[PDB]
Write a protein that binds this ligand. Structure first.
Ligand SMILES: OC[C@H]1O[C@@H](O[C@H]2[C@H](O)[C@@H](O)[C@H](O[C@H]3[C@H](O)[C@@H](O)[C@H](O[C@H]4[C@H](O)[C@@H](O)[C@H](O[C@H]5[C@H](O)[C@@H](O)[C@H](O)O[C@@H]5CO)O[C@@H]4CO)O[C@@H]3CO)O[C@@H]2CO)[C@H](O)[C@@H](O)[C@@H]1O
Length: 95
C-alpha cells in the first residue's frame, strides 16, 4: 500500500511524445503535454486503465488504438497505470 500514490515525488518512468515504451500495472509515468489534447495508444491487445493525478480518473484503453483524454492539463502530468493483465507497449501523445 506504500507509495501507491503517483506524482512528482515517485514516478518511475518518463514518457516521450509519440515514443512507445513497455508498461505494467502500478507504474507511475511522467508526461509533459505542451498543448492540445492528450492521447494514450496501444496495439498489444491488452486492456488497461489509468488515473491522472489531480485530473481525469478511470481512463480506459482496449489495446487496439487510441484513447482521447479530454480535460487533461497542459504541463507535467503524472499518469498511474491502475490495471493491466500483463506488460504491454503504450505511447502518450497530444494534438
Ligand atoms: O507502435 C506499434 C504499433 O503501431 C500500430 O500502428 C499505429 C501507430 O503506432 C499509430 O501512431 C497510428 O496512429 C495514428 C492515428 O491513426 C492518427 O489519427 C494520428 O494522427 C493525428 C496526427 O498525428 C496529428 O498530427 C493530427 O493533428 C492535427 C490536428 O488534428 C489539427 O486539429 C491541428 O490543427 O493540426 C494538427 C497537425 O499539426 O491529428 C491526427 C488526428 O487528427 O496519428 C497517429 C500517429 O501519430 O496508428 C497505427 C495503427 O493504426 C500498428 O498498427 C501495430 O502493428 C504496431 O504494433
Amino acid at each position: 500500500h506504500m507509495s501507491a500514490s503517483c506524482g512528482s515525488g515517485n514516478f518511475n518512468k518518463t514518457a516521450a511524445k509519440g515514443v512507445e515504451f513497455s508498461a505494467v500495472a502500478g507504474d507511475c509515468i511522467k508526461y509533459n503535454k505542451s498543448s492540445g489534447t492528450l492521447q494514450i495508444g496501444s496495439w498489444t491487445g491488452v486492456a488497461s486503465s489509468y488515473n491522472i493525478t489531480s485530473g481525469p480518473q478511470g481512463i480506459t484503453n482496449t489495446g487496439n488504438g487510441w484513447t482521447t483524454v479530454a480535460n487533461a492539463a497542459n504541463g507535467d502530468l503524472y499518469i498511474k497505470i491502475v490495471s493491466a493483465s500483463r506488460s504491454f507497449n503504450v505511447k502518450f501523445d497530444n494534438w
